């Protein structure tokens, strides 16, 4: 981090990561912050996740 | 619910899933032991069909369009 | 000018082993005279020449009623509550388990809607006292009512749930 | 610049004098016409459930023990305008003649007059909460009144064609809060003709759906090809 | 003609599709309101509902 | 067209000082920098003030009538604004470091710490005009030692309770004749008192001190002499207390701790109600509404702010925004949200109307550089240092694509194709262009031909044409599709960054580092016609320079240009403070906005006081960082050549002002651009602004309504339109019968269409009367919906805010009466039984 931010963040990245995530279902109302609105109330898994 | 899955044949699972629902007791349908594992499957496929079919009755009026041009040609 | 509640006698020895927390904030925050019949099993309140008298009455009422030493305090001040009784009158199948569903095991079901309304309820053999604000004793005595009369608990707990958050929100 | 002048000339329509047109209520009785007020209330009502899941902090805040009970109530003496803080006005139902509510009386009044034009002021008058605290607690047990005194207010309320989309998710509410004792007794003939009568005010909300239909199918026409 | 026979057509097969959803949505949930569980507090009931939730994994790239 | 004024700030809901509720407690009030936001939190919307300190602001009160606001920055320069009418009523210069000011309960006076003066000042009135010196002083008390760190008024307006750094704190009666009920001082903490409020009736008074420890003071006997009755302590053993408030009528002091953690407690007795953490970073500010159920939190280092009712344990919001770390912006394909990629690795969706973010996405590792909407607001891409771009379903909120190169590189700017098949990006270390396919994977190709790092992407939207350019002075355009690999190279003068796209894809605007905006046409590759911009740009002098700016050579060239989406205009910025559109056919500069006027930041001024600069260096780059209160602040952790890292204390210097992006509006008539304040939104309205076309002398409101009360509702309507006047229009609208909408929708010249439909989408955006707009929507498509299809560009942004109307209130309408019919159906056509 500190390397990064002292080469003033022109750097070369890190080289690649298949990693695993794991996502339950649940509302996307759920999924977003703390405001009166909303945006999607969608469920987050596909029907063909389901 | 494998029926439902498709695009093609889901209006054959859909009216009988239909007199299922109104033929029997819903009651019934609920206690049954394995019936929230199928409808909490299907429900999702039911809602993206009728997000097309419904998308499909709004591009339906380019015809209703046509024929106030139609009839404004004279 | 007086006022006689009649202690019924389930209630009577707790009545006089925490009576010496009783009558100091009838006889000087209020400002009333106070005697026990020993006779009548009564308690009369007295007003002296130096609108309390029903605040003191429903003290002592909700002491005989059924509810605790703290909770009557609470009704004496805290102008905002109420008290609400009711007898089930909606024998084995009808009464003998009603009231065990209003319990529950070990008295969690009355635990939670107390808790969830943010009344608290004195359930008797079929009567029950409900002291609460308005809208608190209007949301336990709608699940009450509904569970005497036939809900799933899932509903119940569910509209428990609800009403507790719809309760404590603004808006 | 920090008032708004007339222009009414000197010498030696006051909307159109200080260039203003507030917006008259509804155009026609035959047109639908929403809510004056935010145009998230719907969904606010609609999804206040998975709104307030999703607002609720990660973990459970650090409470005392010797907190009192009543806390919510004891206040002191800016004046709560909840429905919690609500007292009765001036012989044992959901609901005694002191105790009660203000829109369980209303109701009533209006089941009686048969004119529920104060009950839905007080509807679209009040908060969310307010609204479903109200609407889940209908009486839905021995003879069904409140339940088919409200279907019949919202009822003559769609009739009027104002605030149109709050009476439709009073309806929601409705089927959603206790649509299954509906469902329950079902073909019992008070419910049922009072369903059936929404219905046959409800069934002439179409003219919103292929209207819309139309502007989107022919704008989005317009706009690519 | 074709206009007025397809429209019916399409909103004869969404009818069954609406009728569909509602219905199923409804016995899921009267079956939910017989016996799911009995959380009031609403920390316990969110764990709850995360435990019991659908998982599904899938591999992402860092 | 070119009459925008300053609308909106997106971003950054809390900067520097205190919130502020209403008195009816609907909207609050959040200094950010040196605006004043006020957010509407049940009417959803939100607006900025426009007026603007020279620094950062410090302190915020407005009267419990709402009429008017007084706002101090950090050197006591106050504004008294009114409230209602958005005007600045007057500039008062107090002279040194005000802490805080309040008004009376009883509106009528005001008092202020000034130092270690409590000054109590008498408000001007809102109906009075402006005076020369509105503000008639009281009295300036003077007891304290030290400077005084809190004010509170008592609930009649008669004494005032003010807490000092001096480890005292004093009650001043008001007027001279309760001077003998109010001379006591109240001594005994061991470090700054924080707070001092008295209770509901004000007999107790609680002081509450910065080490921990909140006194109850009673007026008793051990005569009767305000002893000392209860000590309470927080016991917060590193964490101190750095902001306390108190709501005396439901006895609840809300205090916020240096640890992010804020207790809050029901006071005579000292029961802890609830304890819960904002985050790590300090709590700045706490605020309580005026009936005690809201407490608004602000944290300043992160710039958060949370207002959240204690009851219901909920948060109402919980908002965080981005000062100086906003790389990129985007407008939704309708302008309801605004997408905004910033250096902290985030992406963040911001509604517009509502000042709030919905969405923010954490998936980045390393500073985001582009954000792009494609499939029509579905889906979303952006590209960041870490080295990957990825995509975002903005409906299940889900990263469900990254692409990577093979080459570890690190991707800067990238383009989406309209038919979103393909995602291209490019780097600033590679000079390859790399064209990822979008449904699968995997890396479809690497064009190469710049010999410069390829600065800037764009697809043409309409024939799908790559135009890349890059530091090598070259534009290039690429046909990719269809068997062609054509490659197109335009030389231009100097090395370009930001090129730029027509909405017809004819032409392309690209700004090269000389300071100008050439444009070229694509087909026929050879340059239309170019503006000079590098003698109306605004480049400031920064503090630690040694050249002028006039002959500096920082800033005098933009970054960032965009369309218009009628394709006349240029709105362009850089890293100068100036943003400046143009109309591209005559090439003459149509409007520039000064994007800001804060001192705090560094490009602002372009001369500055020769009264700073002494014999050895300026006064502002002398660091007194150690004469501050602890050690957080003292600390200096800032790791020497840092430029554009993260993390603000670790770069030294000023933050300069720049403006990273600019995008115009795809539905009204605005345009967003990302400075470091904020999402600066720029918008017209037409309630202002008398600006008629071709009336003539017999043209008047009075013969406008003459005209529809005689009932000719053509002549009415484009009576109104020639005087181009909202309310006139609005009325005349409204006024037209259901039974010919179609006969007069038919008759509209064609002149008039896009300031109808322009109308009619702004118009019902907000408006009820959903089946008038509507049916006068279905009128226009149906009557004159052939002259919108040949005429696009000119239909662009009033079509789309058509659009924005039908599917995102009268959708959602009919979504719900739908689900409505169904679930009757269902529960009265089948079987309850048991």
Same mark, same amino acid.
């Not at chain 3, 100091?24 to 005279?33: C, F, G, I, S």
């Not at chain 3, 308005?134 to 569910?158: C, D, N, Q, W």
């Not at chain 4, 019949?152 to 104002?162: F, H, W």
């Not at chain 6, 804020?262 to 609830?274: A, E």
């Given at each position: 981090?500190?390397?990064?931010?002292?080469?003033?963040?022109?750097?070369?990245?890190?080289?690649?990561?298949?990693?695993? &995530?794991?996502?339950?279902? /649940?509302?996307?109302?759920?999924?977003?912050?703390?405001?009166?609105?909303?945006?999607?109330?969608?469920?987050?898994?596909?029907?063909?996740?389901? | 619910?494998?029926?439902?899955?498709?695009?093609?044949?889901?209006?054959?699972?859909?009216?009988?899933?239909?007199?299922?629902?109104?033929?029997?007791?819903?009651?019934?349908?609920?206690?049954?032991?394995?019936?929230?594992?199928?409808?909490?499957?299907?429900?999702?496929?039911?809602?993206?069909?009728?997000?097309?079919?419904?998308?499909?009755?709004?591009?339906?009026?380019?015809?209703?369009?046509?024929?106030?041009?139609?009839?404004?040609?004279? | 000018?007086?006022?006689?509640?009649?202690?019924?006698?389930?209630?009577?020895?707790?009545?006089?082993?925490?009576?010496?927390?009783?009558?100091?904030?009838?006889?000087?925050?209020?400002?009333?005279?106070?005697?026990?019949?020993?006779?009548?099993?009564?308690?009369?309140?007295?007003?002296?020449?130096?609108?309390?008298?029903?605040?003191?009455?429903?003290?002592?009422?909700?002491?005989?009623?059924?509810?605790?030493?703290?909770?009557?305090?609470?009704?004496?001040?805290?102008?905002?509550?109420?008290?609400?009784?009711?007898?089930?009158?909606?024998?084995?199948?009808?009464?003998?388990?009603?009231?065990?569903?209003?319990?529950?095991?070990?008295?969690?079901?009355?635990?939670?809607?107390?808790?969830?309304?943010?009344?608290?309820?004195?359930?008797?053999?079929?009567?029950?006292?409900?002291?609460?604000?308005?809208?608190?004793?209007?949301?336990?005595?709608?699940? #009450?009512?509904?569970?005497?009369? +036939?809900?799933?608990?899932?509903?119940?707990?569910?509209?428990?749930?609800?009403?507790?958050?719809?309760?404590?929100?603004?808006? | 610049?920090?008032?708004?002048?007339?222009?009414?000339?000197?010498?030696?329509?006051?909307?159109?004098?200080?260039? /203003?047109?507030?917006?008259?209520?509804?155009?026609?009785?035959?047109?639908?016409?929403?809510?004056?007020?935010?145009?998230?209330?719907?969904?606010?009502?609609?999804?206040?459930?998975?709104?307030?899941?999703?607002?609720?902090?990660?973990?459970? %805040?650090?409470?005392?023990?010797?907190?009192?009970?009543?806390?919510?109530?004891?206040?002191?003496?800016?004046?709560?305008?909840?429905?919690?803080? &609500?007292?009765?006005?001036?012989?044992?139902?959901?609901?005694?003649?002191?105790?009660?509510?203000?829109? /369980?009386?209303?109701?009533? &009044?209006?089941?009686?007059?048969?004119?529920?034009?104060?009950?839905?002021?007080?509807?679209?008058?009040?908060?969310?909460?307010?609204?479903?605290?109200?609407?889940?607690?209908?009486?839905?047990?021995? %003879?069904?009144?409140?339940?088919?005194?409200?279907?019949?207010?919202?009822?003559?309320?769609?009739?009027?064609?104002?605030?149109?989309?709050?009476?439709?998710?009073?309806?929601?509410?409705?089927?959603?809060?206790?649509?299954?004792?509906?469902?329950?007794?079902?073909?019992?003939?008070?419910?049922?003709?009072?369903?059936?009568?929404?219905?046959?005010?409800?069934?002439?909300?179409?003219?919103?759906?292929?209207?819309?239909?139309?502007?989107?199918?022919?704008?989005?026409?317009?706009?690519?090809? | 003609? $074709?206009?007025?026979?397809?429209?019916?057509?399409?909103?004869?097969?969404?009818?069954?599709?609406?009728?569909?959803?509602?219905?199923?949505?409804?016995?899921?949930?009267?079956?939910?309101?017989?016996?799911?569980?009995?959380?009031?507090?609403?920390?316990?009931?969110?764990?709850?509902?995360?435990?019991?939730?659908?998982?599904?994994?899938?591999?992402?790239?860092? | 067209?070119?009459?925008?004024?300053?609308?909106?700030?997106?971003?950054?809901?809390?900067?520097?000082?205190?919130?502020?509720?209403?008195?009816?407690?609907?909207?609050?009030?959040?200094?950010?920098?040196?605006?004043?936001?006020?957010?509407?939190?049940?009417?959803?919307?939100?607006?900025?003030?426009?007026?603007?300190?020279?620094?950062?602001?410090?302190?915020?009160?407005?009267?419990?009538?709402?009429?008017?606001?007084?706002?101090?920055?950090?050197?006591?320069?106050?504004?008294?604004?009114?409230?209602?009418?958005?005007?600045?009523?007057?500039?008062?210069?107090?002279?040194?470091?005000?802490?805080?000011?309040?008004?009376?309960?009883?509106?009528?006076?005001?008092?202020?710490?000034?130092?270690?003066?409590?000054?109590?000042?008498?408000?001007?009135?809102?109906?009075?005009?402006?005076?020369?010196?509105?503000? #008639?002083?009281?009295?300036?008390?003077?007891?304290?030692?030290?400077?005084?760190?809190?004010?509170?008024?008592?609930? !009649?307006?008669?004494?005032?309770?003010?807490?000092?750094?001096?480890?005292?704190?004093?009650?001043?009666?008001?007027?001279?004749?309760?001077?003998?009920?109010?001379?006591?001082?109240?001594?005994?903490?061991?470090?700054?008192?924080?707070?001092?409020?008295?209770?509901?009736?004000?007999?107790?008074?609680?002081?509450?001190?910065?080490?921990?420890?909140?006194?109850?003071?009673?007026?008793?006997?051990?005569?009767?002499?305000?002893?000392?009755?209860?000590?309470?302590?927080?016991?917060?053993?590193?964490?101190?207390?750095?902001? #306390?408030?108190?709501?005396?009528?439901?006895?609840?002091?809300?205090?916020?701790?240096?640890?992010?953690?804020?207790?809050?407690?029901?006071?005579? !007795?000292?029961?802890?109600?609830?304890?819960?953490?904002?985050?790590?970073?300090?709590?700045?500010?706490?605020?309580?509404?005026?009936?005690?159920?809201?407490?608004?939190?602000?944290?300043?280092?992160?710039?958060?702010?949370?207002?959240?009712?204690?009851?219901?344990?909920?948060?109402?919001?919980?908002?965080?925004?981005?000062?100086?770390?906003?790389?990129?912006?985007?407008?939704?394909?309708?302008?309801?949200?605004?997408? /905004?990629?910033?250096?902290?690795?985030?992406?963040?969706?911001?509604?517009?109307?509502?000042?709030?973010?919905?969405?923010?996405?954490?998936?980045?590792?390393?500073?985001?550089?582009?954000?792009?909407?494609?499939?029509?607001?579905?889906?979303?891409?952006?590209?960041?240092?870490?080295?990957?771009?990825?995509?975002?379903?903005?409906?299940?909120?889900?990263?469900?694509?990254?692409?990577?190169?093979?080459?570890?590189?690190?991707?800067?700017?990238?383009?989406?194709?309209?038919?979103?098949?393909?995602?291209?990006?490019?780097?600033?270390?590679?000079?390859?262009?790399?064209?990822?396919?979008?449904?699968? *994977?995997?890396?479809?190709?690497?064009?190469?031909?710049?010999? +410069?790092?390829?600065?800037?992407?764009?697809?043409?939207?309409?024939?799908?044409?790559?135009?890349?350019?890059?530091?090598?002075?070259?534009?290039?355009?690429?046909?990719?599709?269809?068997?062609?690999?054509? $490659?197109?190279?335009?030389?231009?003068?100097?090395?370009?960054?930001?090129?730029?796209?027509?909405?017809?894809?004819?032409? $392309?605007?690209?700004?090269?580092?000389?300071?100008?905006?050439?444009?070229?046409?694509?087909?026929?590759?050879?340059?239309? +016609?170019?503006?000079?911009?590098?003698?109306?740009?605004?480049?400031?002098?920064?503090?630690?320079?040694?050249?002028?700016?006039?002959?500096?050579?920082?800033?005098?060239?933009?970054?960032?240009?965009?369309?218009?989406?009628?394709?006349?205009?240029?709105?362009?910025?850089?890293?100068?403070?100036?943003?400046?559109?143009?109309?591209?056919?005559?090439?003459?500069?149509?409007?520039?906005?000064?994007?800001?006027?804060?001192?705090?930041?560094?490009?602002?001024?372009?001369?500055?006081?020769?009264?700073?600069?002494?014999?050895?260096?300026?006064?502002?780059?002398?660091?007194?960082?150690?004469?501050?209160?602890?050690?957080?602040?003292?600390?200096?952790?800032?790791?020497?050549?840092?430029?554009? +890292?993260?993390?603000?204390?670790?770069?030294?210097?000023?933050?300069?002002?720049?403006?990273?992006?600019?995008?115009?509006?795809?539905?009204?008539?605005?345009?967003?651009?990302?400075?470091?304040? *904020?999402?600066?939104?720029?918008?017209?309205?037409?309630?202002?602004?008398?600006?008629?076309?071709?009336?003539?002398?017999?043209?008047?409101?009075?013969?406008?309504? &003459?005209?529809?009360?005689?009932?000719?509702?053509?002549?009415?309507?484009?009576?109104?339109?020639?005087?181009?006047?909202?309310?006139?229009?609005?009325?005349?609208?409204?006024?037209?019968?259901?039974?010919?909408?179609?006969?007069?929708?038919?008759?509209?010249?064609?002149?008039?269409?896009?300031?109808?439909?322009?109308?009619?989408?702004?118009?019902?955006?907000?408006?009820?009367?959903?089946?008038?707009?509507?049916?006068?929507?279905?009128?226009?498509?149906?009557?004159?919906? *052939?002259?919108?299809?040949?005429?696009?560009?000119?239909?662009?942004?009033?079509?789309?805010?058509?659009?924005?109307?039908?599917?995102?209130?009268?959708?959602?309408?009919?979504?719900?009466?739908?689900?409505?019919?169904?679930?009757?159906?269902?529960?009265?056509?089948?079987?309850?039984?048991?």
């Amino acid at each position: 981090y500190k390397l990064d931010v002292l080469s003033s963040v022109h750097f070369v990245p890190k080289p690649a990561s298949t990693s695993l &995530e794991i996502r339950v279902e /649940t509302p996307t109302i759920s999924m977003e912050d703390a405001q009166p609105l909303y945006m999607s109330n969608a469920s987050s898994l596909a029907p063909q996740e389901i | 619910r494998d029926w439902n899955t498709n695009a093609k044949t889901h209006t054959i699972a859909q009216r009988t899933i239909r007199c299922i629902l109104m033929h029997h007791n819903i009651a019934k349908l609920s206690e049954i032991p394995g019936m929230v594992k199928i409808v909490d499957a299907i429900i999702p496929y039911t809602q993206r069909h009728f997000t097309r079919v419904d998308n499909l009755v709004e591009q339906s009026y380019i015809l209703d369009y046509a024929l106030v041009e139609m009839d404004k040609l004279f | 000018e007086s006022r006689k509640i009649m202690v019924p006698p389930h209630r009577m020895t707790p009545l006089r082993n925490s009576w010496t927390k009783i009558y100091p904030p009838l006889v000087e925050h209020l400002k009333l005279q106070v005697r026990m019949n020993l006779k009548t099993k009564s308690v009369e309140l007295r007003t002296n020449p130096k609108g309390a008298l029903q605040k003191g009455a429903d003290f002592i009422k909700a002491f005989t009623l059924g509810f605790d030493l703290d909770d009557s305090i609470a009704l004496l001040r805290l102008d905002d509550l109420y008290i609400e009784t009711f007898e089930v009158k909606d024998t084995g199948d009808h009464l003998s388990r009603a009231i065990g569903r209003i319990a529950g095991k070990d008295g969690k079901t009355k635990f939670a809607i107390e808790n969830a309304t943010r009344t608290r309820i004195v359930l008797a053999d079929s009567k029950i006292h409900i002291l609460g604000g308005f809208t608190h004793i209007r949301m336990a005595r709608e699940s #009450v009512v509904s569970l005497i009369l +036939g809900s799933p608990p899932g509903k119940v707990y569910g509209n428990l749930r609800t009403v507790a958050s719809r309760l404590k929100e603004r808006y | 610049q920090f008032k708004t002048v007339s222009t009414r000339t000197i010498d030696e329509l006051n909307d159109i004098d200080f260039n /203003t047109y507030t917006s008259l209520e509804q155009i026609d009785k035959e047109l639908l016409t929403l809510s004056i007020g935010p145009r998230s209330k719907m969904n606010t009502l609609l999804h206040l459930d998975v709104i307030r899941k999703r607002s609720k902090p990660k973990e459970a %805040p650090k409470k005392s023990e010797k907190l009192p009970f009543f806390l919510q109530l004891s206040g002191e003496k800016s004046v709560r305008e909840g429905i919690a803080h &609500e007292t009765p006005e001036e012989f044992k139902v959901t609901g005694r003649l002191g105790f009660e509510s203000h829109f /369980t009386k209303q109701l009533r &009044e209006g089941s009686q007059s048969k004119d529920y034009s104060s009950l839905l002021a007080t509807l679209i008058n009040f908060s969310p909460a307010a609204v479903d605290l109200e609407i889940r607690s209908l009486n839905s047990f021995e %003879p069904f009144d409140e339940i088919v005194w409200f279907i019949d207010a919202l009822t003559q309320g769609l009739k009027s064609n104002k605030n149109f989309e709050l009476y439709e998710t009073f309806m929601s509410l409705l089927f959603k809060a206790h649509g299954d004792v509906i469902h329950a007794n079902n073909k019992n003939q008070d419910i049922a003709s009072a369903l059936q009568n929404w219905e046959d005010v409800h069934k002439k909300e179409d003219r919103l759906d292929d209207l819309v239909k139309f502007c989107m199918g022919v704008a989005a026409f317009v706009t690519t090809a | 003609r $074709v206009k007025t026979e397809l429209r019916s057509a399409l909103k004869s097969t969404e009818d069954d599709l609406g009728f569909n959803v509602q219905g199923l949505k409804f016995v899921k949930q009267q079956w939910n309101l017989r016996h799911n569980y009995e959380f009031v507090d609403e920390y316990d009931q969110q764990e709850k509902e995360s435990n019991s939730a659908r998982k599904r994994v899938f591999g992402t790239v860092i | 067209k070119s009459d925008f004024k300053f609308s909106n700030l997106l971003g950054t809901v809390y900067r520097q000082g205190n919130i502020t509720f209403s008195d009816d407690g609907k909207q609050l009030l959040s200094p950010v920098g040196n605006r004043v936001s006020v957010f509407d939190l049940i009417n959803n919307k939100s607006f900025t003030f426009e007026y603007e300190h020279r620094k950062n602001i410090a302190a915020i009160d407005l009267n419990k009538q709402g009429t008017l606001l007084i706002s101090i920055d950090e050197d006591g320069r106050a504004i008294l604004v009114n409230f209602k009418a958005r005007n600045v009523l007057h500039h008062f210069n107090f002279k040194e470091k005000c802490s805080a000011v309040k008004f009376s309960p009883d509106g009528r006076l005001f008092a202020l710490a000034s130092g270690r003066f409590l000054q109590i000042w008498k408000t001007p009135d809102v109906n009075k005009d402006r005076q020369f010196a509105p503000f #008639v002083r009281h009295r300036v008390h003077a007891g304290h030692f030290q400077d005084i760190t809190s004010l509170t008024w008592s609930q !009649d307006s008669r004494f005032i309770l003010t807490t000092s750094k001096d480890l005292s704190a004093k009650i001043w009666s008001v007027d001279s004749e309760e001077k003998n009920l109010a001379a006591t001082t109240f001594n005994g903490h061991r470090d700054y008192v924080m707070g001092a409020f008295f209770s509901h009736d004000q007999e107790k008074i609680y002081t509450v001190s910065k080490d921990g420890a909140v006194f109850v003071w009673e007026f008793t006997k051990r005569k009767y002499s305000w002893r000392i009755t209860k000590k309470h302590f927080f016991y917060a053993n590193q964490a101190k207390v750095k902001c #306390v408030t108190f709501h005396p009528a439901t006895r609840l002091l809300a205090v916020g701790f240096t640890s992010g953690e804020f207790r809050l407690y029901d006071l005579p !007795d000292f029961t802890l109600i609830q304890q819960l953490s904002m985050g790590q970073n300090p709590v700045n500010t706490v605020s309580v509404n005026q009936t005690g159920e809201w407490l608004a939190f602000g944290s300043s280092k992160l710039g958060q702010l949370l207002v959240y009712e204690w009851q219901s344990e909920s948060y109402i919001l919980k908002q965080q925004g981005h000062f100086d770390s906003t790389n990129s912006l985007a407008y939704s394909p309708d302008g309801s949200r605004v997408v /905004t990629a910033s250096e902290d690795g985030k992406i963040k969706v911001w509604d517009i109307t509502s000042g709030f973010c919905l969405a923010t996405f954490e998936e980045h590792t390393s500073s985001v550089t582009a954000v792009q909407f494609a499939k029509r607001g579905q889906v979303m891409f952006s590209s960041s240092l870490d080295g990957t771009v990825r995509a975002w379903d903005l409906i299940r909120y889900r990263n469900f694509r990254t692409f990577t190169g093979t080459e570890r590189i690190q991707f800067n700017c990238l383009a989406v194709d309209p038919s979103g098949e393909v995602v291209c990006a490019g780097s600033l270390d590679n000079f390859d262009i790399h064209v990822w396919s979008v449904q699968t *994977g995997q890396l479809l190709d690497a064009l190469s031909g710049h010999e +410069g790092p390829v600065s800037c992407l764009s697809f043409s939207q309409e024939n799908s044409v790559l135009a890349s350019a890059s530091w090598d002075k070259t534009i290039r355009i690429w046909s990719i599709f269809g068997r062609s690999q054509q $490659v197109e190279p335009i030389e231009v003068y100097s090395d370009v960054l930001a090129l730029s796209m027509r909405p017809d894809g004819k032409e $392309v605007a690209v700004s090269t580092l000389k300071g100008q905006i050439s444009i070229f046409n694509i087909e026929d590759a050879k340059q239309v +016609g170019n503006i000079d911009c590098r003698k109306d740009i605004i480049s400031g002098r920064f503090n630690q320079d040694r050249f002028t700016a006039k002959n500096s050579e920082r800033s005098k060239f933009f970054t960032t240009i965009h369309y218009s989406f009628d394709g006349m205009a240029i709105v362009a910025g850089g890293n100068n403070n100036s943003i400046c559109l143009y109309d591209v056919p005559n090439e003459v500069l149509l409007k520039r906005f000064i994007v800001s006027r804060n001192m705090a930041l560094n490009g602002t001024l372009e001369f500055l006081n020769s009264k700073k600069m002494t014999e050895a260096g300026s006064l502002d780059l002398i660091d007194d960082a150690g004469e501050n209160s602890d050690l957080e602040d003292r600390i200096d952790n800032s790791l020497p050549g840092s430029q554009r +890292g993260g993390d603000l204390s670790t770069r030294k210097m000023r933050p300069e002002v720049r403006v990273t992006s600019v995008q115009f509006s795809p539905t009204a008539n605005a345009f967003a651009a990302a400075s470091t304040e *904020g999402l600066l939104i720029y918008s017209t309205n037409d309630t202002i602004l008398f600006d008629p076309f071709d009336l003539d002398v017999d043209v008047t409101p009075h013969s406008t309504v &003459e005209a529809l009360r005689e009932k000719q509702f053509l002549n009415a309507l484009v009576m109104a339109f020639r005087l181009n006047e909202e309310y006139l229009i609005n009325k005349v609208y409204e006024a037209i019968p259901i039974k010919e909408i179609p006969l007069v929708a038919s008759n509209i010249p064609a002149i008039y269409l896009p300031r109808i439909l322009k109308f009619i989408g702004d118009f019902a955006i907000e408006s009820q009367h959903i089946e008038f707009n509507l049916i006068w929507i279905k009128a226009l498509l149906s009557a004159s919906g *052939g002259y919108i299809n040949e005429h696009k560009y000119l239909f662009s942004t009033a079509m789309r805010s058509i659009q924005r109307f039908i599917v995102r209130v009268a959708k959602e309408v009919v979504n719900t009466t739908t689900d409505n019919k169904y679930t009757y159906r269902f529960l009265v056509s089948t079987d309850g039984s048991m």
